[PDB]
Design a protein around this ligand. Structure first.
Ligand code: FAD
Length: 392
C-alpha cells in the first residue's frame, strides 16, 4: 500500500505511446532514471531526413545515444545561401564557430537510419507494434489505455508521444486543436552527392520568389534535398505529376536546381503540405504527459521538431531522477518545456512567413540581408535557439 517503495524494479511502469523520435527518446530517459517502460506503436511496420542541431545532439549524447549521431550524422561544416537566378553566393561561411559555442557538431541524418538505430538501441523486442491507442483513463491508482485491436494496458505513468495527430492530446487538453496550414508545400528526398549541385560538406540553399531549394549532406555520400513553394493547400499533385510540377515552379532557377529536378526519383520523393498547431499552455494532466509533436507541432523551418522531442525526453528523465511523485514531476516537466516549445513553434512560424513571401517585401528585405551577411548574425541567431535548450 502506502508503504511500497517505488524505486524497486517493477514498482514503476511507464506506458509510452509512439515509437518515433520522442517515444524512443522518452523510454530511454525514463529507463536511465530507473523506470520500466513498455513502448507501444501503432504501425506494424516502419517508415526523408532531419538536421539534428547541437541541442538535439547533446540530448542524444546525454541519453546514451551519442554514437548514433557521430556515426550517421552527415558532414555539415559550412552553409551558403545562393541567388536563384545566377546560382551565386549571396553569403557563405563555416559553422565551426557554432560547434565551439554550442559544444557539438550539427548532425543531418536520414529519418530512416535514425529511426532504425533508435529502435536497435531500445530493442524491437520491447516495442509492441500494431498497437494504436484510442483512449486513456486515469484514477487514484494509475492510468490505463485502450488499443484499436481490443487490448489495453495499465501503468503508473503515461507518455503520449503519438505524433502531430496525437489521439491522446485531446484528453490532456480538454479540446481538439486543429492543424493550421502554413501556406507552403515541401518536396523532400535523398540523392547521391554530386558537386554539379553543391559542396558535399555544405548546407546549400537557393532562395527567391518566396521559395527555396536546399541541400545538406547526410551519411554515406548523400544529399537530403527539399523544395519549398508557397501554394494553396489541396492542389492535384502527387508523385506522378512531381517532376513537371517542380520544373514549372522553378523555371528559370540556376542550372544546379534543374540538375536536381532531373536527378531525383519521384517515387521516393515526398510531397508534404506544411502545417503547425497553435501552442498549448498545457502539456500534462495527472499521470499523462504529451511529448514531441504530440505536445507541440511546428513548421520544420528552423529544424527543431525532432530536436525539441529529444529535449523533452531529457527533461522527462531528469525530473524523475530523484522523485517518484508523478504529479509533481510532470508539473516540473511542463514548467521547463512549455515556454521553450511555444517559442520554438512561433519562431518556426515567423521564419516560415519571412521565407515564403507572406509579405513579399519583408522576404525581399531578408534576401537583401543575405547579400550583406557575413555569417555572424545567422550564427548568433542559431546559437540563441540552440543554447536556449535544456542542456544549454
Ligand atoms: C519536412 C520536415 C522536415 C523536418 N526537419 C527537421 C529537422 O531538420 N530537424 C528536426 O529536429 N526536426 C525536423 N522535423 C520534425 C521532426 O520530423 C518531428 O518533429 C519528429 O519526427 C517528431 O517526433 P515524434 O516522435 O514526436 O513524432 P512522430 O515521428 O510522428 O512519431 C509518432 C509515432 O507514434 C505513432 N502513432 C501515431 N498515432 C498513434 C496512436 N494513436 N497510437 C500509437 N502510436 C501512434 C506513429 O506511427 C509514430 O511512429 C521535420 C519535419 C518535417 C515534416
Amino acid at each position: 500500500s502506502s508503504g511500497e517503495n517505488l524505486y524497486f524494479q517493477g514498482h514503476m511502469k511507464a506506458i509510452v505511446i509512439g515509437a518515433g523520435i520522442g517515444g524512443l527518446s522518452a523510454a530511454v530517459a525514463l529507463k536511465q532514471s530507473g523506470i520500466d517502460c513498455d513502448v507501444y506503436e501503432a504501425v506494424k511496420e516502419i517508415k526523408a531526413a532531419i538536421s539534428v542541431w547541437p541541442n538535439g545532439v547533446k540530448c542524444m549524447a546525454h541519453l546514451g545515444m551519442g554514437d548514433i549521431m557521430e556515426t550517421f550524422g552527415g558532414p555539415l561544416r559550412r552553409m551558403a545561401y545562393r541567388d536563384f537566378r545566377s546560382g551565386e553566393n549571396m553569403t557563405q561561411f563555416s559553422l565551426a564557430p557554432l560547434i565551439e559555442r554550442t559544444g557539438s557538431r550539427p548532425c543531418p541524418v536520414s529519418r530512416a537510419e535514425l529511426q532504425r538505430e533508435m529502435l536497435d538501441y531500445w530493442g524491437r523486442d520491447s516495442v509492441q507494434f500494431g498497437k494504436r491507442v484510442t483512449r486513456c483513463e486515469e484514477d487514484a491508482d494509475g492510468v490505463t489505455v485502450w488499443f484499436t485491436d481490443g487490448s489495453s494496458a495499465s501503468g503508473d505513468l503515461l507518455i503520449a508521444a503519438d505524433g502531430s495527430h496525437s489521439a491522446l492530446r485531446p484528453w490532456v487538453l480538454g479540446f481538439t486543436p486543429q492543424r493550421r496550414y502554413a501556406g507552403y508545400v515541401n518536396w523532400n528526398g535523398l540523392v547521391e552527392i554530386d558537386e554539379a549541385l553543391a559542396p558535399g560538406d555544405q548546407w546549400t540553399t537557393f532562395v527567391g520568389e518566396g521559395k527555396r531549394v536546399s541541400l545538406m549532406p547526410v551519411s554515406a555520400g548523400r544529399f537530403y534535398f527539399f523544395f519549398d513553394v508557397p501554394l494553396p493547400a489541396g492542389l492535384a499533385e502527387d508523385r506522378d505529376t512531381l517532376r513537371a510540377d517542380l520544373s514549372r515552379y522553378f523555371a528559370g532557377w540556376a542550372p544546379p536546381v534543374q540538375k536536381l529536378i532531373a536527378a531525383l526519383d519521384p517515387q521516393t520523393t515526398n510531397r508534404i503540405e506544411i502545417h503547425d498547431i497553435e501552442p498549448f499552455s498545457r502539456l500534462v494532466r495527472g499521470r499523462v504527459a504529451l511529448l514531441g509533436d504530440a505536445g507541440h507541432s511546428t513548421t520544420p523551418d528552423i529544424g527543431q521538431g525532432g530536436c525539441a522531442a529529444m529535449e523533452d525526453a531529457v527533461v522527462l528523465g531528469a525530473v524523475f531522477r530523484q522523485t517518484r511523485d508523478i504529479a509533481a514531476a510532470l508539473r516540473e516537466y511542463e514548467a521547463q518545456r512549455c515556454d521553450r516549445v511555444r517559442d520554438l513553434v512561433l519562431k518556426a512560424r515567423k521564419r516560415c512567413d519571412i521565407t515564403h513571401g507572406k509579405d513579399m517585401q519583408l522576404t525581399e528585405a531578408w534576401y537583401q540581408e543575405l547579400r550583406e551577411e557575413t555569417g555572424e548574425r545567422i550564427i548568433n541567431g542559431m546559437c540563441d535557439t540552440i543554447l536556449s535548450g535544456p542542456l544549454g
